[PDB]
């Protein structure tokens, strides 16, 4: 056991834009003239950047002696995630979590003559259910060889500090990965068009800058807070309302800096123009145009199932192995309001929602479907209804009425399609629903 | 013209609204603000915008 390295250059992995020594030597009268009087500048340029992989160096006076290490410093860091406030309790038993919502009905006018033969008719309540499952199971493994590591230090304090650094790093990695997973939740939600997108980069005024984004955020927060509710801010298209105290705004550092420099500075009474939700600051999003995300307190559905640590010792190899197991479920709820303030280019239509996602009809029954198109512009788009069951006699009317042929047995798929591209180059956004056959 | 077109238009809209509200509640009343053209009076605490 003797690991050695030979002829390691001082400049290992550096790519210099320009040669500092050559720039100092040449270019008389330039900005580099200040370093001309410095006699020992080449050595400073060579060494001050830093040295990777050192080698034994003999001192200049007596070649036999070797220069030694003067000072040893140990760097340690502690990290934690700022999104930990968005978690809930733990579930010890079970895997799947169910969520049920009930929407509102529709009004009918008073008709005594029609009420003669419709006393016992049925009106199915509008209910929607969705499920969350456990999806994260990981562990961190780290080994420590005390006896083999003892030769790299000459002081017990430094040895113990370096030993504890690994234990600290394990938990630092755990926290970092948890934060990354929580950010990935938002990124994945945006990647599927499930956010209600609002463009904040199109002012309508001659001087609309420095205020358009904050005006949009305040207006959207008020619209969410409106008591009568709306179906335009959730991916399930259900009539619901939120509250001002439950609205959380995940903001970008650049946008917060823009707000502080522009709005809050040159404006008295900052309470009349500050943000309305509870502001949480992150280091930007992975999406191209994402700038801010406004959600409800119930949007997050993060739970933890397991958090444990186990240690084993190898006595033949004289070392310790540490395993840190983390099991968690990470999910978001489609029943809560979710707005994405985006300052880039977005497609005209982001999604199409069919109100009954799952249906079960008989061989002679009929079903009614409703299509909600989420568009980023005031233009109105027309949906096209299609059925891909396969059996003859099954057709869907333009308004959204599906009828089933008398004799057939196969699962049916109902699609509402919206075309947003130009001619001879289709760009289709499709919303799908599934239908089963009762008999 | 357009309250969202410029900050001057919003100021003009505020001016017009305030002037109309002030002249609505004049003690002598007016008949220029109803479809029946009857001399009537409003009150400041009974005006909703």
From Swiss-Prot, chain B:
Cellular localization per UniProt: Virion
Where on the tree of life does the source sit, at the highest rank? Viruses
Q: What does this protein do?
A: Assembles to form a prolate capsid shell of about 54 nm in length and 45 nm in width, with a T=3, Q=5 symmetry.
Q: Which family does it belong to?
A: Belongs to the phi29likevirus major capsid protein family.
Q: Assembly and interactions? A: Homohexamer. Homopentamer. The prolate capsid is composed of pentamers and hexamers of the capsid protein.
Protein name, entry field = Major capsid protein
Q: Lineage from the top down?
A: Viruses, Duplodnaviria, Heunggongvirae, Uroviricota, Caudoviricetes
Gene name for this UniProt entry = 8
Could you say which residues of the full protein are shown? 201 to 249 of 448
